[PDB]
Design a binder for this molecule. Structure first.
Ligand SMILES: O=C(N[C@H]1CCCC[C@H]1C(=O)O)c1cnn2c(O)cc(-c3ccccc3)nc12
Ligand SMILES: O=C(N[C@H]1CCCC[C@H]1C(=O)O)c1cnn2c(O)cc(-c3ccccc3)nc12
Ligand SMILES: [Zn+2]
Ligand SMILES: [Zn+2]
Lengths: 348, 353
């Protein structure tokens, strides 16, 4: 039932105050860390990146769990693609404050994360009612997790910033020309790109700032959602997709079959649905039920075909069997089909 | 009559190549001048502002270019001059210390320094000369003479603070380009150009005037309600062509009546301002369908005429500043331009022959 989707959206709206006060607590701690980090010669150019579901207004997860990125301005770097993977790179320099992090010619993610982690842990000791845990088994990103007031969790990810042209692997990505326009695609591609440490001393491409821009400025019409005539359901469809997946992951947290899926998979599928449906009239709020059904159906088709390209790097298949086994896709496919056939009881 | 408008537009297009190679000649000289300028401690933050009719793709009449040099400076505090809404004294909340006169930044001293270093560096660049631009209140400050090509150069201080209060009700693009876009543009810097606020000696010699030329460029080059306006055949509009035709109509009338003083105070900025107001009044892309170029241009002309008859043409960014005030343009000049435009319109624009 379409009205059951609206009921979910209504209740997700109720967490807005708690997300906002928690975010205010996070900002105060993060601002103090950045000021202390800036005092170190290697991290002088550190800053907040201001990305993630909170800033996209699509935060449906726990109000006590945030993800923040610290960006670091770097000398003009030279990238070397690792093993034709299109998304992972070694970082070298064309010409250095990060010299202490070099391992031969390449920038060591291990050495940089070590100092990043040590400074944060030292500085958290002088912040009232805050502790820090090293995030393990994520290849280095996120690097640390803060615990604020014994209530709020903050995953912190380090990201190198490069103002160079985007790597060649992105040349055919971000296929927004028929939706957001060729002019916008060109303007976005003039923005920096980021590299997060992600296991070899490899770094992985990140475009979280571009995803935020697209989600918050999402219509073909510049006035999309700014008046009653132009209210669309794009952002509500994404919230519902994220909530469906999170609810199913929670329901089967015991079993192992859904642990490899993440919000990024549904977010990526959603961007492809936007490419496939570029007109605002295809997203009329009065058709929220059908729009969500088509979003679910698209995600199911990705699962069944085992194809879900990174929206920026089309040759990187998030649904490769190297990343997610076939049985996990089959399990999630069956669970979602069951839910959809029964008007989503996991939403009850 | 619409086909005659298209004939004008096609002929204006023939000058694209010559504008481009001349613009390339200018870019080389300006780039070298800026590199030399940035060696001076006061102008370390100098840069090219990518504004003007060329960058807007609407350069119609004339080998003559206008360019702006932006200057990053420390945090500025503004003092409005005589309720003029557009003219300010500049104070600082310092590289420009030698150009203060008391608490305020002297436009006179800044121009003298700007003109000196330009004249110094041009002495090395061969096949380029510079003369002082006079009787424009300080903006433009100089004119470069390259090889056939003239380049007016304006100095523009950059302020990254919130825009002045006088702009609070301007830039009324919310129903056309969106409230989100208006917010994003108002987060961009604004500029101040040295500009005498009134004739005569005194405090009026040290004022600076608000400039939003970069915002005008952004809106003109990204002008549709639809992000894909003019990017495909279904969404071709005639906004930019209407502006070109309005500017060409004024330029041709100013040339035809160069023996009078009536049209001397009108400039392309008046029709550009009127055009932005017409875009506010007609916010939907379907109102600008290329099939209706003739009617769209007629409606642009009509709007300009109404501004003339009512003696009201607010600055698009500063709504309390009336470009058509009697203090700036006398009634008889507005009436003369009104009559000549009406004659042209009634006769299928003989100035476009
Ligand atoms: O959760 C995320 N990803 C997981 C699911 C996809 C495979 C990696 C997983 C992981 O690294 O944990 C994820 C959250 N943001 N983000 C992002 O901005 C980029 C990428 C990405 C992925 C592949 C290639 C290049 C970039 N992933 C993410
Ligand atoms: O030609 C231009 N202006 C003439 C016609 C209007 C009155 C002043 C005239 C002059 O200064 O010569 C003009 C070209 N750009 N530009 C601009 O970017 C801003 C302004 C402006 C005007 C009034 C108040 C605040 C700003 N004018 C211009
Ligand atoms: Zn919308
Ligand atoms: Zn257009």
């Amino acid at each position: 039932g379409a009205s059951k989707l609206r009921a979910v959206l209504e209740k997700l709206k109720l967490s807005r105050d708690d997300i906002s006060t928690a975010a205010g607590m996070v900002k105060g701690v993060v601002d103090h860390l950045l000021l202390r980090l800036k005092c170190d010669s290697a991290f002088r150019g550190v800053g907040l990146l201001n990305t993630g579901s909170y800033y996209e207004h699509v935060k449906i997860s726990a109000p006590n769990e945030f993800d923040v990125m610290f960006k670091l301005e770097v000398p003009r770097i030279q990238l070397e693609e690792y093993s034709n993977t299109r998304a992972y790179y070694f970082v070298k320099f064309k010409r250095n404050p990060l010299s202490q992090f070099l391992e031969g010619e390449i920038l060591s993610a291990s050495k940089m994360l070590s100092k990043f982690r040590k400074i944060i842990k030292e500085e958290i000791n002088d912040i009232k009612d805050t502790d820090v845990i090293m995030k393990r088994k994520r290849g280095g990103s996120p690097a640390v997790t803060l615990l604020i007031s014994e209530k709020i969790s903050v995953d912190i990810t380090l990201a190198l910033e490069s103002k160079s042209s985007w790597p060649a692997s992105t040349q055919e990505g971000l296929r927004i020309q028929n939706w957001l326009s060729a002019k916008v695609r060109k303007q976005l591609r003039l923005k920096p790109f980021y590299l997060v440490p992600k296991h070899e001393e490899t770094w992985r491409l990140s475009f979280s700032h571009i995803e935020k821009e697209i989600l918050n400025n999402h219509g073909k019409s510049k006035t999309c959602c700014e008046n009653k005539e132009e209210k669309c359901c794009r952002k509500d469809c994404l919230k519902l997709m994220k909530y469906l997946l999170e609810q199913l992951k929670e329901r089967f947290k015991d079993k192992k079959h859904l642990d490899k899926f993440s919000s990024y998979h549904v977010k990526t599928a959603f961007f492809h649905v936007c490419t496939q449906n570029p007109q605002d009239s295809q997203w009329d709020r009065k058709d929220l039920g059908l729009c969500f059904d088509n979003c679910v159906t698209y995600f199911l088709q990705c699962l069944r075909t085992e194809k879900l390209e990174n929206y920026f790097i089309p040759e990187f298949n998030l649904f490769s069997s190297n990343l997610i086994d076939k049985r996990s896709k089959e399990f999630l496919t069956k669970q979602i089909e069951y839910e959809r056939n029964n008007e989503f009881p996991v939403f009850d």
